Amino acid sequence: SEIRKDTLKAILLELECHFTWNLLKEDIDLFEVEDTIGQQLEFLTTKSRLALYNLLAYVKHLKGQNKDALECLEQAEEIIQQEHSDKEEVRSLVTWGNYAWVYYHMDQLEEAQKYTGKIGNVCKKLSSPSNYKLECPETDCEKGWALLKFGGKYYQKAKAAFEKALEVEPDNPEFNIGYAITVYRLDDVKSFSLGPLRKAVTLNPDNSYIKVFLALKLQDVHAEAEGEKYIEEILDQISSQPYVLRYAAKFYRRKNSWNKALELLKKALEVTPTSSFLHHQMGLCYRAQMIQIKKATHNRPKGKDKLKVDELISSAIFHFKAAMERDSMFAFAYTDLANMYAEGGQYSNAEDIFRKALRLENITDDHKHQIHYHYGRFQEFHRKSENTAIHHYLEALKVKDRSPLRTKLTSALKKLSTKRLCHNALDVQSLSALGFVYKLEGEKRQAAEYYEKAQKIDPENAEFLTALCELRLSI
């Protein structure tokens, strides 16, 4: 019954849980996010797992695995009853909301209704100003973690949420970890997060997770020795924790300690061998060492150095391929592989990989942006095909017009267009590109001038029509 389903849905929309927090699947690589959560769950004391489990449920639902979501929620509830607490029913609200939603998506409306009933009973007994939600620091914290896990588009939101929690308990250890981590990811380099991370470490003395990020930030601001002291402080504790291991390995990698990084990444991979992220990290290690050697030997490594370089290239390729095999949506692996091929002169291979990458549909717009950027670079400096380079820089801008890559893209587009003017009138490609760039930079008259020509050459082009229709609104 559509009527009953919508009637229930109206209530579901009032709840506080992952299903009402605007966490768009399009914004993430589902398999990566699932991998990340699984890694954070490893050998983690059960108590600290609640939020993870709730989030994992939502993620399993996003993957079309509602039963696995049920399993995750069963685990979350068990964690809740394991804490024996007089904050129990309150602590169960998110889990219950997720239950209600998951049962709704399984067309099992009465179950869902049971959970909305429990939630409503709790809200009424506590005389909440809302019928199906309850103002709660814990819930703000949980939402903070969910947002943070959905990536760069959500960091500001995450910060807001942690701050709300922090407004109630400013010295709560967990809230402080979430806030500090969020400001850390926002730092990507700035170091606004240094104070917050120091405080978070102070409030969580035996927590490896927060210390590794303090170490990474200390490294960022050229306080390497202190950071390394933190890393050594957590080494023994993290030997079964792939998630912390990979950041410790990152610290070592950035310090050029290749074998230390590889040692930790190998332990991590032994915990979670299905991980694309971990393979990709290994490949990055091999690659960085190879680059360091080529640099030192002025691009002519001899003897042992030569052997080592070959071996490193093969290892890097191996790991980027492993990462692609474990998650076809893991875009960084494709572009790193293709770029390594391109550097070695292997243009046919680079092209195979790039083409696979350009044909992926269900990846995020950020990844697509970057893929187009890299393929355009490949076209400009290796193929020497300025037209295709223009096409892809343009695509990169269309998909995501305000990123750290915006100036590179716009300047490159202007430069390549001007180079087109050396012997020929502008192609429709270059005209389109300049129209786009100038419209984006605010030069509406010039943009309009370029689109007029683009149109005159291609009269039925819907893009030029729409651009002109829009531009004629101005001034």
Structure tokens given for 357:
């990458």
Q: How far is CA 374 from CA 38, 235, 279, in A?
A: 31, 36, 21
Nearest partner of 379 among 339, 414, 406, judged by Cα: 339
Q: Cα–Cα distance between 310 and 293 in angstroms, integer?
A: 11
How many other C-beta atoms can be found within 10 angstroms of the C-beta atom of residue 56? 25
Tokens 């768009």 map to which residue?
24
| Phi–psi pair at 316, nearest 5 degrees | -60, -55
Q: Output Rg (C-alpha) for the chain, integer angstroms.
A: 26
User: Which residues, 6 or more positions from 458, have their beta carbon under 8 angstroms from its beta carbon?
Assistant: 428, 464
Give the chain's end-to-end CA distance (angstroms, integer): 53
Q: Cα–Cα distance between 468 and 87 in angstroms, integer?
A: 60
Q: Return left, alpha or beta for 22; rule: phi > 0 is left, psi -120 to 50 is alpha, else beta.
A: left
Q: Cα–Cα distance between 121 and 127 in angstroms, integer?
A: 10
Per 3-state DSSP, the chain is made up of helix, strand and coil in percentages (nearest 5) of: 75, 0, 25
How many other C-beta atoms can be found within 10 angstroms of the C-beta atom of residue 237? 14
Q: Cα–Cα distance between 330 and 313 in angstroms, integer?
A: 20
**HSE-up of residue 262 (Cα within 13 Å, Cβ side):** 15
Resolution in A: 2.2
User: Which residues, 6 or more positions from 350, have their beta carbon under 8 angstroms from its beta carbon?
Assistant: 338, 339, 341, 342, 378, 382
Mapping DSSP to helix (H, G, I), strand (E, B) and coil, where does residue 313 land? helix
Q: Cα–Cα distance between 202 and 271 in angstroms, integer?
A: 29
Structure tokens given for 73:
């929620």
Q: Cα–Cα distance between 106 and 103 in angstroms, integer?
A: 5
The amino acid sitting at 249 is A
- Is the separation of the CB atoms in 6 and 87 below 8 Å? no
Q: Return left, alpha or beta for 257; rule: phi > 0 is left, psi -120 to 50 is alpha, else beta.
A: beta
Structure tokens given for 42:
């490893």
Q: Cα–Cα distance between 380 and 388 in angstroms, integer?
A: 8
DSSP for 50-83?
HHHHHHHHHHHHHTT-HHHHHHHHHHHHHHHHHS
> Please, which contacts does 22-27 make with residues 24 or more away whose CB atoms are closer than 8 Å?
23/58, 23/146, 23/147, 23/150, 23/154, 24/150, 25/62, 26/364, 26/365, 27/150, 27/151, 27/153, 27/154, 27/364
How many other C-beta atoms can be found within 10 angstroms of the C-beta atom of residue 395? 18
DSSP for 325-354?
HH-TT-HHHHHHHHHHHHHTT-HHHHHHHH
Q: Cα–Cα distance between 184 and 247 in angstroms, integer?
A: 13
Tokens 């809740």 map to which residue?
80
- Going along the chain from its start, the domains and CATH numbers come out as 1-132 (1.25.40.10), 133-191 (1.25.40.10), 192-475 (no CATH)
- Is the separation of the CB atoms in 169 and 192 below 8 Å? no
∠ CA 169-173-176 to the nearest 5 degrees?
75
Residue-level length of the chain: 475
- Is the separation of the CB atoms in 147 and 139 below 8 Å? no
Q: Cα–Cα distance between 457 and 471 in angstroms, integer?
A: 18
Please, which experimental method was used? Answer: X-ray
The amino acid sitting at 146 is A
User: Which residues, 6 or more positions from 172, have their beta carbon under 8 angstroms from its beta carbon?
Assistant: 137, 165, 166, 203
The conformation of residue 43, written as its DSSP 8-state character, comes to T
DSSP for 77-142?
HHHHHHS--TTHHHHTHHHHHHHHHHHHHTT-HHHHHHHHHHHHHHHHHTT-SSSS----HHHHHH
- Is the separation of the CB atoms in 125 and 24 below 8 Å? no
Q: Cα–Cα distance between 236 and 233 in angstroms, integer?
A: 8
DSSP for 136-161?
-HHHHHHHHHHHHHT-GGGHHHHHHH
Q: Cα–Cα distance between 97 and 90 in angstroms, integer?
A: 12
243: Cα separation from own chain's centroid: 15
Could you give the dihedral angle defined by the CA atoms of residues 253, 255, 256 and 260, in that order, rounded to the nearest 10 degrees?
Answer: -60
Nearest partner of 319 among 273, 364, 250, 351, judged by Cα: 273
How many other C-beta atoms can be found within 10 angstroms of the C-beta atom of residue 469? 10
Structure tokens given for 471:
């531009």
Tokens 């295709």 map to which residue?
388
Q: Cα–Cα distance between 321 and 282 in angstroms, integer?
A: 11
